[PDB]
Amino acid sequence: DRHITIFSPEGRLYQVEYAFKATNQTNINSLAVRGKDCTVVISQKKVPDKLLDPTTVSYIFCISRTIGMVVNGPIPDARNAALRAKAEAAEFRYKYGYDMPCDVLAKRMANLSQIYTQRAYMRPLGVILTFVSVDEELGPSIYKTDPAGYYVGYKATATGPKQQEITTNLENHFKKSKIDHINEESWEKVVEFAITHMIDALGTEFSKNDLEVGVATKDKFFTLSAENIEERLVAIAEQ
Template identity: 55%
Template sequence: MTGSIADARASVDRARGEAAEFKYKYGYEMPCDVLAKRLANINQVYTQRAYMRPLGVATTLISLDDEVGPSLYKCDPAGYYVGYKATASGPKQQEALNHLEKKLKNKDYAPGDWEEVVELAITTLSTVLSVDFKKNELEIGIVGGPISENSDETSPAFRTLTEEEIDERLQAIAEKD
């Protein structure tokens, strides 16, 4: 989420409610593209009603589906949603998108395993912000990576990387340079 904290909280609560209602009604988890479309429709209604203030938040949705595989969608306050290979949000969004576009040009997805994808994300942030990061300055979440730090088994669940794992990725980036 990028934008107003209060609007982000309201949007997350609404998304959770929509996903729970979908699961109750149909008996399976709501696909990411369906949730993105629903949130975009809700946001679009907020822009048309005179008595409702538009939500000032951009939402990025990430999922790992058994049928579709990994999915990444972004919804904006105007009610527009689109799927991406990689995306960014925030003040330097366009610079980050340009960097990612150069790196992923003519590719269907980011090549390599989860470690190389995380390194691409760190490199993009570092390039756009002109900052060399330390392990305690980053918080990284992954979906579909290893269950734990020293495990070869993968999990479809979301988890955050430990500072040691982030430090390993920073060291790998430093060795490439």
């Protein structure tokens, strides 16, 4: 029972629980927040090996024109999920004539995860997927998928070892603001907010190399270069 996705006498799926443990292997924290018409993802980048090419080290994926995905968990399973999600989104657009919604993609990937929880021959992927978009109907959207095949929408979310500290700080901010979103008109200020909040939660300053940032807008999802992150960090230093 410990080795395959069958029930224990307690009705537990131990391999699913252990796949959750794998999601923290990378020791990386990610944060997502909604603006009025953008969604921002912040992820830590840890590149201690000087021989790495840092531009290749990313846990943020462009799934479609409109959907970004950030992964917590080991990069091979992350790239598996990313490739599958890309294929699903292109196939959806082909079958149905419109861009796959972020919530629909999250549902589909969660159902694949459920299959891995139910069929013994496939292990779970050890990854948590956070999808972000500005939906044509739902507006800015965060949907997060996990190894159980659970998914839900979020006002904001964090993932990783310190997700409780970031989450409680976000919750306190929403208690302070009485809103379901960050009240700012342009994504640069949402990025600056999200970075400032990650700093306050983790207690660490960031260089432009210590972060990666994804922004979903109505037109596209895109990832910031290190120099755009520099511009945001100096803005925080000066604002």
